[PDB]
Amino acid sequence: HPDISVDVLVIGAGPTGLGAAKRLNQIDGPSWMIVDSNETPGGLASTDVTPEGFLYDVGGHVIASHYKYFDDCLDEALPKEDDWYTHQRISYVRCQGQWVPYPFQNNISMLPKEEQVKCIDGMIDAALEARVANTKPKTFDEWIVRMMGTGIADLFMRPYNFKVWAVPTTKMQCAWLGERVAAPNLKAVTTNVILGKTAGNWGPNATFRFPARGGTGGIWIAVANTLPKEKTRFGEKGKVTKVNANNKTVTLQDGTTIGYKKLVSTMAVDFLAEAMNDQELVGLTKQLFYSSTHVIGVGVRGSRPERIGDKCWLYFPEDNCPFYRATIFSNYSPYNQPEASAALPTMQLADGSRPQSTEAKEGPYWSIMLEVSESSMKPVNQETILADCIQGLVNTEMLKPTDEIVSTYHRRFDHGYPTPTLEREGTLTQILPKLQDKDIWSRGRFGSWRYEVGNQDHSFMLGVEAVDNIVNGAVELTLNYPDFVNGRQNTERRLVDGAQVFAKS
Amino acid sequence: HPDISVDVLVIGAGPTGLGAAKRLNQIDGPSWMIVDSNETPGGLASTDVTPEGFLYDVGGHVIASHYKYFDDCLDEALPKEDDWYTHQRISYVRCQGQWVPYPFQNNISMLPKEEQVKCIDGMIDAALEARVANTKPKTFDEWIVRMMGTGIADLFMRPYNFKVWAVPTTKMQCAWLGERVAAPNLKAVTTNVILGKTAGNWGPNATFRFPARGGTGGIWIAVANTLPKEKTRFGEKGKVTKVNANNKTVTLQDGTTIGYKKLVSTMAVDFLAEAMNDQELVGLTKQLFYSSTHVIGVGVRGSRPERIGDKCWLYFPEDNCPFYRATIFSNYSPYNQPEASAALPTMQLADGSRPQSTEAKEGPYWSIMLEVSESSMKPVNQETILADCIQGLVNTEMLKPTDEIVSTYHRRFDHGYPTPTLEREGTLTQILPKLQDKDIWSRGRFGSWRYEVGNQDHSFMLGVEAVDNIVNGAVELTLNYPDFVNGRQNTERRLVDGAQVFAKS
Amino acid sequence: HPDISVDVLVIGAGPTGLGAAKRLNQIDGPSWMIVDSNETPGGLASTDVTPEGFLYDVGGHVIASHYKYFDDCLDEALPKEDDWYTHQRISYVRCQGQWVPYPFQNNISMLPKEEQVKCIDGMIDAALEARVANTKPKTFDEWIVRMMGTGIADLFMRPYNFKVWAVPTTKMQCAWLGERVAAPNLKAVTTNVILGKTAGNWGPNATFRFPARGGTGGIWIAVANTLPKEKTRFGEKGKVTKVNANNKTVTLQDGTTIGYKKLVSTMAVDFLAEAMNDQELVGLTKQLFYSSTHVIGVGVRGSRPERIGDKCWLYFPEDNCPFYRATIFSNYSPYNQPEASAALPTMQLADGSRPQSTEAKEGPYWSIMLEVSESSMKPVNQETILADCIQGLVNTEMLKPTDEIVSTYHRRFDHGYPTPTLEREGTLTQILPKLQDKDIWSRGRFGSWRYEVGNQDHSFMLGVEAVDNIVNGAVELTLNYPDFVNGRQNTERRLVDGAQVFAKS
Amino acid sequence: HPDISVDVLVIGAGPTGLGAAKRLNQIDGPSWMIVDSNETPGGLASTDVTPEGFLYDVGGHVIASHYKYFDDCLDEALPKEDDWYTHQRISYVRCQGQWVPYPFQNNISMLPKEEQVKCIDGMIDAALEARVANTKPKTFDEWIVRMMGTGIADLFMRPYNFKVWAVPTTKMQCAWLGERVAAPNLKAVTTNVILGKTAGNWGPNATFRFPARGGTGGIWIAVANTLPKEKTRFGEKGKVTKVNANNKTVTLQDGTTIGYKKLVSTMAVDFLAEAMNDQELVGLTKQLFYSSTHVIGVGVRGSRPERIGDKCWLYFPEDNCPFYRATIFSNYSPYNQPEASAALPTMQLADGSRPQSTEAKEGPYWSIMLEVSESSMKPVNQETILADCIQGLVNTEMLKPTDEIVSTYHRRFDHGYPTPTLEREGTLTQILPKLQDKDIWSRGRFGSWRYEVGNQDHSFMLGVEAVDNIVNGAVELTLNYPDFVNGRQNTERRLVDGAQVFAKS
């Protein structure tokens, strides 16, 4: 007989696990507990801080919620207006010395006329081909070229997406992009070119909110704080080392055994297969592909440069920098970096030189957060990637040679992106139903490995819907139908449902 | 204060209302009750019997279930193998003296060669147009011609659907038919013509089960008998006469008032509007279109004629009979008509003659169930429709002039089919939200008025999902996404869910 | 017995008849004779001169030769290099205050940006339609809109062609335009728009030669002068008044009778039918459509204005002027107008004002030749057309209000354009075979009524080929296959053929 | 000074050279002379006779005249009604044990139904592709598949054409087939399949005439007889051995020298290059490709078998016979083989065995003429080809094993077909203009090497038009525009033109 017995055991307290726990808590029927090897919940949605007081998320995290249930829980966790800042969704592509507003194709009037000609000719071919197309594209690369044409594809989406996925676009599927037919809006693109118009896809109605304090990790700390503590086990004490699916027993690092009826596992499924000592599954999970993420943080002395302005995140297709995305993290909250009166010495100049003077000088400060991908098809030299990133900031005119860097951050995350390879779905249909047949709900960014439902809200709801399926027989829509959940406002499920209203009365 | 108060009130005990009742009874959380103006539950899924012992459903009723939950409840209601009979889904189209197997286009080798040429040429045109189509059809008629071509459309789907819907195909939408592209399978059609092949879309895998006793109506009597009797109020004592949405009170025939927190209403929504005394809603619901259904039943003396054989239902595009559909109801269960040793006099011969003898003679017996539509665009003479129907049986060679009729049946159902007109959605998206804002879930074949989810299983699940939405925040998938639920096996929701399992432990 | 008898009689000494005569004279086999009612040969390719010394062709006459035989005869007639001037084929379209280089669609970068967007959107639509087109256009109007799209059609070719043909584009065929697929060159058009580029279809190799003296008329006088005079009868003494097809006799004005074996008639075929007193033929030729041509000439004091420059001819789609085409005739030869030292009084200013002085003043001078079309569907007030033309010159900014007019010219030509109506070929294929059966070769711009082979070189060659058919059994290629002769340089037939070479030896 | 000087010298007295001769003779202007190495005119349009009295043309020769001039000369040469037999153009394809009427695709209803399905499926694919096709086919093979689809292509046009051209279809151009769009008539093919219908492309209006006596060669002997004998030089005395293009002198085998001004050469252009000792031309003409033709004749004892009947020529795509075409040559004229009273011994039975009796026996007799192609890509065993052909006749059921063969014939013609390879035009546009500049008109089946104008009428007219271009400056239409002459009735040029009429008077 195990040390602990619950109806539903949740493994992992990132957004997916916390989601399962929140729904389990709301329903308040079956017994449950949640474990995590980390003392701080949040997983890849956590936040680090440098010794100099600069916060960094695990790369650019911007919330775009598809669900009221997610909203309810974030509101409960951080109920004050002062707990959040709101920003418009401002992003640009760096291309040929210019900041081109996203979406790229609507803004190519910024490029030289000769480049515009190439882009439009390319898009005209794609329009004419789309007119007689009667097959769906089979790879990411095909989808891109059918949408954009060759010229526009080559300038942005093709090289950018290799830099992101660390695999060629020709090796990825394209179903994860949704149901929209791959064809250009030639009229829109030519119209902006003719008018000499630029326009970004943001405005007063395209916004996101970011926690005032603690970065994205502040959300999951606060969400986890609403749970009954005695149903949690976070830290070394909650590290899972063995899963015996046949016995329905989990063994923790310290020897504790937990017997479960149903298991919601949100750890990476390849980790799960190993903990299961299941050779068949280890074999299958090894067929999945993923990239690692290097997060580089740079803290900079000065008031925010005009050339930076209200930019939020930024895309880099070109090979004059190693990162694919930059985030002006200091724009997200004034509390992501020290107050202006905090005194810090200059660590280095952006040109790589180190000043002799160790004088601590005041701010204000701003902060850049960068991401570099790694895979078996794209190695990263860990010893030089910080300096290479900083030179990249100089090349892209984000930093002047003389800008004073007062803090640096670098951390490599092993499981960063689950890759939508051509083989992904075939491998998953062998893995997830096998786990299902053992009453294991493997869910989450790497729990179920689908990037198209791999954001914070998706992950949260993968956990919530897994519990809802377990308890109430609900359809796991986010898991099986990403296009369905992503194409609608999901408003039906709420932190207070009729069940709780009727019960209280 | 009202005579009775419940959390959830369900009006109507046809399949939709019984679905709501079943799910409420399973959840066993919020209080509830169900009412009906009829002492016998079933609604349009009920069964009548003639004084001579011939059963008739409300027209051809064949179960094609898309949900496990539905199956669960039917298995619970009628658990014995002896409670059901299984049959292949056998149907034909009556065309030019021939019984053409369904689907019609795959079987036109039974037509004159010169006619096959016109059909194939028509479909060739449709195939060539479909290759370069860049728009969806906007009407049912356009959908039909794009799928079949002019020649085949004119033989079956165009005149048949006018006879069913009592409105022209050009006046109806086609979104209700689902997301499949409107285009011909030219090779399938030419292949069967070249091979001289006939092929029906049935066999060992394509079957349905039909209740052994009491007709389709026996299902719903049995399902209702699983409910706690005291939460039911069926008969004149259960007839709703007034709905006060602002006070959340319902008034019954006998003066009884019921207070509710949430209302699931499964009566026709135009009747609901009347019972609410809501002028705006009455205005809107009057803009909805529907057809009435005449059901004609004919009991015939004799063993099953060879020409009839194992036929189940039959379509009639042509103008030599008033019915659009016939069902060989005696093929569905040997208990839909009297036993062979039951003695009955011949009422008339099929050509209308008097019988040579008026004394009771034994069987065996077989039985035909016919349907005739009526609308403001297609009147039906009630005084002569029985006689016209019987003449139709002769014209279509279903009866010989000498066949002996031993029982007749005629009944008119006012609300028969909810019509997918071009205007339907424009109207419903004005009605259903207004009811929703008053905590009224109006659901069902005429509760929510959508034929594409208008079968028994759809209706049951509309009730089930409305409750699940009320109590558990579930998405009402059947109501809002017909294509979703009809395109998948809906297996997640069960009559015993996790909630009930964990509760008992 | 007639007064004169020849093997081949040619009626008319315009280009077509002179072609017949040149070939007859070269062959020197059958006896022959050519007549004309005008003392001066040249027909519609003749030239008038005002009392003040300004020459005017019959509207813009620019030579574009498809035949070396035509070239040979022109070289023979006017052999000196001093006999000709060479110019680039410089043309513009007047649109919205701008001189837009031809071809119009390649130069819409000159238009307002909002208009460019509408133009490009229309041509995108045409490009996409053209990709799936499986039918030929059936009218001139369809041809135009399929080539240009709605926006560009509406700016130039649709209104301009009404002004030219004096019938709507919807009433004309399009076979006469050749074999080219009706489809846009979207890339060409978008590229110049993107580049902000203009480009006319002319250059050092896109030229024409014009006679130094006597206008276009000087060519045909010189060509006719190479013929044996005694075989020509030009003037009142050459006016044909009756053609007895049955007796192969022609009666002239003065009563001279001419017997022939074969007749080449180059007069208008409706006049020929009348001269034949052939009722059936009069009816048929009456079904042919044609427009009349008003030629207006304006002589202007001053050196060539900068705004005019090297412009040759000009197209006018808009309604602020009655003419469809303008020619800067002073640019074709310095001898089309008086020398600078010639003294002329100012007749009026361009705004209609009297001059300050009526004294004869010196030049230099320049000159504009205008064309206005007339038909039953487009009446022309002959009393006001000159004044309206001059106002149109001010409206289009060809003339300043202050420009001094020193000579005016106006002549109406009854048969100006033979119209490619939808009915043209139905009618011609009844007329030409009947004439042929009587050994009458009716040929020429109105002799056979086909505009697509209606220029000077076509006409000349129609005469030549008619003779070559009569004598040598040659195919009349220009007559029956416009696309054939227009799509090649016809090099085989020369003014000195093998026959004359072998004979001289 | 050469022995003989003429204005125009014609080398070769096949149809092309005779055409040149007839036109020169008609014009009666320049002096001329025609030479041939054979005593008998006709070339590949000649006829051999076996020692047993069986005539054979050089393979099946059936006249289909596009020209009135050709008709004129044939009528002059053979003026009597009994100089000719008229037959319908009856042809069949041998395929899977059956004679299928030509055109094959309209008659596939004769094939097994499953095979019809594959044929129609293939043609449906090709129709759908043709609906969106915007490129011309570039090879003969692409052309075939676009017209027929894969299934039908593989049954007839692909294997047959390899057997004809002795090169794969993928190695040939397709321009030579004309301007018709490469696309199936799906409706016509499926219609005959549906109706179970067969129809050949012949009847009372689809006929050919054949000379009563002497085979096809009788025509050209007769045409030659109309020429002034002293201007002909036929046999060893007329064999050209050397051409000196710079001196314009031809040397004959007997040493005779002929000076010319213009040369019409109708020998194979690769032979002409050799005779010119022009190494550049030798190299060029070696790039042309041709196949050799083996003609096999089989004379058979008996009245014409019913299984043969009225068949004229027959196509053989399959591998059970080496010949590609058979002609029932005894059907073309009763004088193509001996009268029934002629006594001949049986040489062998068709199964290869010796005859029972070696005695001369009476007829009647019938006769089969076969063609086998050979090239560097398709070698032929010349030692066994007669036996292989005879066995081929047994395999195809044209002959019974017991049929008595009384005569056999085999002759290999080295230049048989000029092959429309992909390279042909690139080579010919270097050859023919180079010869042209030297005043050499190289014309004819191998004179100018274009099979699409390679029949008797084409050839004849290539000669006629060469002369007409040399003397009258005519366009060489047949040479340069095959689609033009083939697509019309060429009626303008006659054996008596106006020139001869006007001169006689």
Curated annotation (Swiss-Prot), chains A, B, C, D:
Disruption phenotype: Exhibits a marked growth defect, reduced cell wall thickness, and leads to the absence of short beta-1,5-linked galactofuranose in the galactomannan and glycoproteins of this mutant. Strongly diminishes conidiationa and increases susceptibility to drugs such as voriconazole and nikkomycin Z. Displays attenuated virulence in a murine model of invasive aspergillosis. SUPFAM superfamilies: Nucleotide-binding domain. Changing Q105A: Lowers the catalytic efficiency. It catalyses: UDP-alpha-D-galactose = UDP-alpha-D-galactofuranose. UDP-alpha-D-galactose binds at residues 59-60, 102, 105, 157, 160-161, 165, 180, 205, 315, 325, 417, 451, 455. FAD binds at T16, D36, L44, G59, H61, V240, R325, R445, G454, N455, Q456, S459. Binds 1 FAD per subunit. NADPH binds at H66, R89, S91, Y102, N201, W313, Y315, Y417, R445, N455, H458. GO terms for molecular function: nucleotide binding; UDP-galactopyranose mutase activity. Belongs to the UDP-galactopyranose/dTDP-fucopyranose mutase family. Contains a flexible loop (loop III) above the si-face of the isoalloxazine ring that changes position depending on the redox state of the flavin cofactor. UDP-galactopyranose mutase, key flavoenzyme of galactofuranose metabolism that catalyzes the 6-to-5 ring contraction of UDP-galactopyranose to UDP-galactofuranose, the donor used by various galacto-furanosyltransferases. Controls the biosynthesis of galactomannan and galactofuranose containing glycoconjugates. The flavin functions as nucleophile, forming a flavin-sugar adduct that facilitates galactose-ring opening and contraction. This is UDP-galactopyranose mutase. The lineage of its organism: Eukaryota, Fungi, Dikarya, Ascomycota, Pezizomycotina. The gene is glfA.
